[PDB]
Symmetry: D2
C-alpha cells in the first residue's frame, strides 16, 4: 505494499494541516538518501563519500524550499540558506555516520533532526541551538543489507524500506515501539579502564547475574545507526557514556544524540546522559558532545538508578 513514504508524509501533512513544506523537505531528503545508498553500494567500484554525502544532503535540502538553517557534522559553521530558497525548518544532520567502517562493509547511516525556526530575525546558527524536545521530526536512514528509513514525529515511529526496483520507500512497520525490557547491552568495553563506577557496576551485573538470571548478550557494531536500530527492533540498551577521551562523551548532541533520543522516546523508550533526559539539554555549540544511554525503559531505568545510588 500500500504505502510509499511520499504517500505517508502527505497524508500526515494534511492531517496536521501543514503548508506542505515538510513534505517537500522529506521528499528531497529521500532523494539524497537513495543516492547515498547506491553510492555506498558501489563504493569499491568508484573508478570521499562523506563529502559527496554532505553535498547531496545540502543541495537537495537547499532546493526543497523548506529550510533556512542547516547544520552538518561535516561543516564548521551552520549554513544559512539563500533568501530565495528559504523555508521555515532548521535541519541538523549527520550525512554519513559510521564512515570509519565503509571499508568493513558496515551498516552506516544518515541521521537527521528537524526543527521549526525559533525567532523571526535573520535565520542564524542560534536557530539550531534548540533542545531536542522541540523536534518536529527525526530519524535516520540505515545503509545495510537493505536500505531502511526510520522516521519519528508526534504520532510515532515508522520504518520504510527502499524498493530498489522503483526508487521508493515502502512503509513496512507502522507505529514501532521498543520492548519494555531487552536482553542485549551494547557498549565499547575497550574503554573499561576509563568508565565511571556506575557504568562499571551495570556492566558487571549484566555479565555475572546474581544467579540464575541468564546474562544479557553483548553486541556493538561500532556504527551508531546500526546499534540504535538493533536496539529499537529487538530491545535492550545502547551506551556511549563519558570516558577520559571525552568527558562530555563522543557522540554529537545536535545530529547524533537528539535524533536517536527523539526516535527512542517516540518508540516508548528512554534516552539520558546518566543525569538528565538528552532531549532537555539546551546546546551551546552546534558541534557539542553529549554522553548517551538509550533503549528499553526497564534497562535504561536500571542504569539510572545505579547512577542515583552512586551519587
Amino acid at each position: 505494499n500500500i504505502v510509499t513514504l511520499t504517500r505517508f508524509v502527505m497524508e500526515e501533512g494534511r492531517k496536521a494541516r501543514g503548508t506542505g513544506e515538510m513534505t517537500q523537505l522529506l521528499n528531497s531528503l529521500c532523494t539524497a538518501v537513495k543516492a547515498i545508498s547506491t553510492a555506498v553500494r558501489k563504493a569499491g567500484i568508484a573508478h570521499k563519500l562523506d563529502v559527496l554525502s554532505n553535498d547531496l544532503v545540502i543541495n537537495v535540502l537547499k532546493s526543497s524550499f523548506a529550510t533556512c538553517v542547516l547544520v552538518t557534522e561535516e561543516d564548521k559553521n551552520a549554513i544559512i540558506v539563500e533568501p530565495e530558497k528559504r523555508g521555515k525548518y532548521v535541519v541538523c544532520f549527520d550525512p554519513l555516520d559510521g564512515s570509519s567502517n565503509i571499508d568493513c562493509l558496515v551498516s552506516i547511516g544518515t541521521i537527521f533532526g528537524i526543527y521549526r525556526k525559533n525567532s523571526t530575525d535573520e535565520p542564524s546558527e542560534k536557530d539550531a541551538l534548540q533542545p531536542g524536545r522541540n523536534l518536529v521530526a527525526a530519524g535516520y536512514a540505515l545503509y545495510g543489507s537493505a536500505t531502511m528509513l526510520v522516521l519519528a514525529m508526534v504520532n510515532g515511529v515508522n520504518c520504510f524500506m527502499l524498493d530498489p526496483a522503483i526508487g521508493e520507500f515502502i512503509l513496512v512497520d507502522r507505529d514501532v515501539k521498543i520492548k519494555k525490557k531487552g536482553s542485549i547491552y551494547s557498549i565499547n568495553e575497550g574503554y573499561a579502564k576509563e568508565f565511571d563506577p556506575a557504568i562499571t557496576e551495570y556492566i558487571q551485573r549484566k555479565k555475572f547475574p546474581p544467579d540464575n538470571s541468564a546474562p544479557y548478550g553483548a553486541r556493538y557494531v561500532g556504527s551508531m545507526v546500526a546499534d540504535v536500530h538493533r536496539t529499537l527492533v529487538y530491545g535492550g540498551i545502547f551506551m556511549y557514556p563519558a570516558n577520559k577521551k571525552s568527558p562530555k562523551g563522543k557522540l554529537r548532541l545536535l545530529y547524533e544524540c537528539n535524533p536517536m533520543a527523539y526516535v527512542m522516546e517516540k518508540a516508548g523508550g528512554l534516552a539520558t546522559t546518566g543525569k538528565e533526559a538528552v532531549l532537555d539539554i539546551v546546546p551551546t555549540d552546534i558541534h557539542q558532545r553529549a554522553p548517551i544511554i538509550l533503549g528499553s525503559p526497564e534497562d535504561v531505568t536500571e542504569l539510572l538508578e545505579i547512577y542515583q545510588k552512586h551519587a
Copy 2:
C-alpha cells in the same frame, strides 16, 4: 574494472588445468548469491529467507553438474546428488548466516567450503567428513551496505564486490592479506561468567594493557561473516570459544569454522581451537561444533601462549 568473478575463475581454472567443473560450480553459486542479495534487500517488502536461501543454493549447485554431496546447515542429512547431475565436488554451506539479525538490518552472509570427493564408492555423507586442510576453495558472501564475495583458494584470497547495474562481481582487492597485528578484539562478553581462564586473562590484557599501550577497541556484530570480514580487512581477533551452553563451542565446523579458518590461513592469519589448528580437526558429524579463535597472527599467537601457560 578489468576483472569479473566469471573471468577470474576461468583464468584460475585454466592455470590449474582443471576440467571446468569448479568453474561451473563457482558461476552457479554466484547466481544464488546474487539472488539471495536481492531478496535480503527487499525482505521487508515481501508482500522464511533461510528456507528460500537454502533452496537457491541447493538448486544452483545441483544444476551445476559439479557436485555429488551437499551439506547445508538447514538439512539434517547430507544431500546426495542424483547420478545424472553429479560431478566431483563436496560442498558444505551455510546459506544464510546471522539470520537472527535480518530483523535488525544487519550484515548476514553465505558461507561455503568446497571439497574434492574422497573415495570412489557411492557418494555419501562421509565424503563431507574431511579435515578443512583438504579444502579446494572456500569463502563467503556478505550481504551489507554493499554485497561482497570473498573467495580463497591455493593462491590466496580475493574480494569481489557486486555491481548491481550488471549483476557481476568485480575484483576489488587481489591477494588480500590480514595485518600481522590488530587492535580490535571481538567476542560476546555476555558469556564472561562461563569463559575459561585463558580467555578471561586475554580480555583483561586487552582492556588494561600492562604497558600503557593503548587498549584494543571492542567490536562484535553478532553475525560471523560480518565479524570475520572486519577482522580480515582491519585486523585483530575474533573469538567464539566454548562456554557452558556450548562446551564444544557454538559455531559449526564444516560450514562456519572451516571456511573462515581457510580464508584466514590463506590471508596469512591463524585459526585455532585454543589447542589445535581448526583446519586439522577431523569432523565426526556433519553438524559438529568447534570453538574458534582467528585473526592476526600476532594477536592469535598471544592468546595461544596464554592457553599454554594455563595448561
Copy 3:
C-alpha cells in the same frame, strides 16, 4: 546532472505561483511511471500489464490530492475522485499505449494530458470534455532502451531520463524544438487502399520526388509514443488519418491525440486532422477518436496544402 524532475517542476511551480497541487500530481505520476517501467522490463519473468498500469496510474493520482476527474483509456466512464482526495485537475491518460507490442519488445508508453477543472458544480465527465488548447501540461513516458519522460507546459518541452540507480528522472534536454523540416514520413501504408486522395498524393511525392530530390525515409514502429518521439527528436511527419476501419481515425482525442498535439505545438511543430488544428477540437465523448497529422511545420503544411487543393 543538476536537475531532477522533482526539482524542475517545483521550480516551475514557484515561478508560476502555484499551490503545489501540480507538483504533487506530477510527483505521483512519476511513481507510477517508474513502477510501469520496471514491470515492463521484467514482463516475461512475471512468474495483464495494462490493467496493472491502469491501477497504478489511478491510485497514485487519487492519492496525489491533486485531481477530481480521471479519464483512462481502460475505463468506460470517467472516474470522479472521492471528495476527501479531490484537487482541481482533470487528467486524461492512456496508461499503457502500444500494448499489442509488449510481446515484440516494442517501445510502449504512457500518455497524459492535464486540465484545470472547468466549472464549480460537482466534478463530472463533462469536466474532461475540454479542447486541447486548455491543457496546462501534457507529455508521455516512453518505456524503451531507456525510460524517458517528455513533459510540455506553457514554457516548452523538456525531456527527462529515468536514472535506474536512484529512481529519479534527470533533465537531459531542456526546451526541445522540432526541426522545421524533416526527411522521414511515418504512416501505416498497409491501409493504402483505404487512404483518401490527399494522403495518397503526399505519400507518392515522398517516394517519387520530382527528381533530384532525395526521397524521405519511411519509419513506422506501430506504437504512437515511439513514433511521435522519433518525430520530435529527428523531425518529419507522423500520420494516422481516417480510413475505412475508422472514418474518424483510430487514435483517441483526449489521451492520445491532444497530448501529442500539445507537445508538438510547444516544440514548434503542428498537429491537425487535415481540416483543423487537433487542439481546437471540442470533444463530445471521452473516448472519441480523431484523425491526426503532426510533425515539422514544413512537412505538415505541405500535406495540409494537398488537402486544400483537393477540397
Copy 4:
C-alpha cells in the same frame, strides 16, 4: 524461473561434449551485453556508445580465451587475438546496431555470429570469410523496454530476458519457431523508386490483395534487430533488398545478415537474397554487403516465386 543463460549453455556444452570454450565465450559475451544494456539505459545521463560498445565486446571476447579472430563492424580489419589468449572461435559482430536511433529511444541491439576456425595456419582475416552455413551459433541482444538475448545453435533458437535484479538472463521461450505465414511486411518504402520489379509487385499485392483477403499491416522500426525480432515472434517478412544507393544491399553479410539468417532458419523461417540462401553466400570481404529477405516460409517463398517469374 528455472533456467539462467549460464545454466543453459553449460547444459548444452556437456550434451555436445565440448571443451567448454564456447561456454566461456557465451558467458563473456553476456557480461558485455549486460554492460551495454545499462549504458544505453543511462546514455542521456552520461555526464560514443558504439565505441564503448565495441571495446566492451572486444575485451570480454579476448579475455574469454575462446577466440582467435574478431570481426567488428567498427574495425577496418579483423582483430587477430594475442597467442596467449587465443582459443578456436571466430566471432563476427555488430556491437551496437541501429545507432542512428539511440537518439530516438529506439530498440537497438548487438548482433553476433560464431565460427569454428577453419585452417591451422596462423589465424587471420580469411578465417572469417566462411559461408553462414558454417555457423556454430549466432544471435542478438535487443536493448528495448526489456533486454532480450536470442540465441540460435544446432538444436534451435532460444530467447532469454535480462532480470536486472540479479544480472542474469532467464530462459523465457525455448525452441522458438516462426509462424509459417505472417500478416506484416517490413521494408523502407522510402526507396520505392529504386526497387526492382519483383519487390514492387509483392508490395502492391500486400496492400491490394487480389482476393479480398485483408491487406498485410506495415511495420519498419529502422533498426534490424527490432524488425527481425518482431518478425521472429509475430511472423511475416523483413526486407532490405538492393536499391540504387546500395546495389549490393545495405546490411552487412558477416555480422548483420548471416546471424539473422541463421536465427531465422533455425526457427523454421527462410532467408534469401532473392536469388540464393543468404547462408550459402561466401563472403569475399569482411565488410561485404548483401540484400536480404527473411521471415515466415510462406511469405518469403511467395516473394521468391515473383522473382522467379520476372527472371
